[PDB]
RNA sequence: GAUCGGGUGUCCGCACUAAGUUCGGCAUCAAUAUGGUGACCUCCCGGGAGCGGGGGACCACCAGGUUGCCUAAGGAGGGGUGAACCGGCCCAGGUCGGAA
């Protein structure tokens, strides 16, 4: 009976630090400190002193409502980094491969937390939201790659989805999904435009 | 490209064909902000909050030449079709911008729109 | 405005959380096309020796084009030692082949 807002504390977030100018490189420090403080006070180390173990959060562990927080970040990490890599790759051609490399595993957080949003133990409010985001990292993902046909998808998918939730809500709560889905129109004409 | 206007430095838009893809609201207003106080001279930056703008000066003439695309990337073709435009507007229309009276600007009538149209058909087969 | 109500910090050897400073330890991927360097192996053609010319199999490394069934990550980043003679290059003298 938790529910989550990862919209909103995306937003909030990243207005606060840094990217309401567009610096990412901050946002990615911003986001390593705080996924560094969540684990800290939650006490889940990956791994000890000589030693490292990659742990999963599994569905009996998310009843403090924070650990998703630990993938939020981690995606939020992975996007910011590839953002400014996206930015950064105009002099220099090679960082496309580590944009893509690092954009491939984003999407991987982001359907790994939409998997672990399919408890009964959270509300359903958090699962239509996981899913959109997933659709729009992967959006984003194949629309980099220059694969149009399943961006166009995704993009439509993510679209449907904010759309039902901003009519489900009132109009002062459904203008955060309205510059959401304005944001993604431009992405979507241009997908749609490619091919010609 | 989706947004392109020809004004001149007396505040007087001479061609555009925005059409319904755009509306120029404010969308040039920020670049003469910009401009005239911060005097940017940064090969064609400052995207004021939506959509890249870049923009191009005649001090033979007093022109502007502003194209806007989407913040998405885009090639380097929209230099060299500015450039081009210019060049056209330039050996062209050469009769109405010599003259320094805006009345003679006024009177004529510039049919520039096959012409552009034909240009940017050319960039976009370049592009593909 | 006479009593009167009490709600909130200056005080804490107090506990937690959000945002930042500072100091240590560990580790920092690979396939593929092309050219190059260094060892090792193998085909040859010529010659009285030192030897000259051409072709291949395999390993290590650098510049670098498209990549991934790659991870908590793995840049085509920079510097130094390079040792006892064991990375080679140009190699003094000396040394061996040859009249040169």
Redesign the interface.
């Known amino acids: 009976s938790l529910s989550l807002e990862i919209l909103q504390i995306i937003k909030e977030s990243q207005q606060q630090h840094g990217l309401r100018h567009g610096d990412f490189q901050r946002y990615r420090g911003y986001c390593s400190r705080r996924q560094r403080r969540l684990r800290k006070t939650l006490n889940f180390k990956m791994g000890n002193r000589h030693k490292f173990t990659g742990k999963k959060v599994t569905e009996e562990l998310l009843t403090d409502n924070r650990y998703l927080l630990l993938v939020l970040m981690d995606a939020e990490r992975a996007w910011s980094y590839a953002m400014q890599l996206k930015q950064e790759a105009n002099t220099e051609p090679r960082k496309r491969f580590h944009l893509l490399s690092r954009l491939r595993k984003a999407v991987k957080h982001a359907e790994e937390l939409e998997r672990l949003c399919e408890s009964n133990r959270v509300d359903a409010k958090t699962k239509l939201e996981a899913q959109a985001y997933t659709a729009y990292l992967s959006g984003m993902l194949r629309f980099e790659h220059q694969e149009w046909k399943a961006a166009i998808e995704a993009f439509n998918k993510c679209k449907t989805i904010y759309e039902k939730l901003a009519s489900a809500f009132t109009e002062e709560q459904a203008v955060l999904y309205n510059q959401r889905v304005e944001e993604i129109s431009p992405n979507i004409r241009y997908c749609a435009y490619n091919i010609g | 490209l989706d947004f392109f206007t020809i004004f001149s430095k007396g505040g007087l838009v001479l061609w555009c064909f925005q059409g319904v893809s755009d509306s120029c609201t404010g969308p040039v207003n920020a670049l003469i902000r910009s401009v005239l106080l911060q005097e940017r001279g940064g090969n064609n930056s400052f995207t004021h909050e ?2 890249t703008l870049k923009y191009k000066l005649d001090n033979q003439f007093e022109l502007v030449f502003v194209v806007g695309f ?4 885009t090639l380097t073709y929209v230099d060299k079709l500015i450039d081009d435009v210019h060049r056209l507007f330039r050996d062209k229309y050469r009769t109405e911008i010599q003259q320094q009276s805006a009345l003679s600007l006024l009177n004529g009538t510039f049919d520039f729109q096959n012409d552009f149209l034909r240009l940017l058909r050319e960039a976009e087969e370049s592009s ?1």
């Open positions: 939506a959509l989407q913040k998405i990337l593909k």
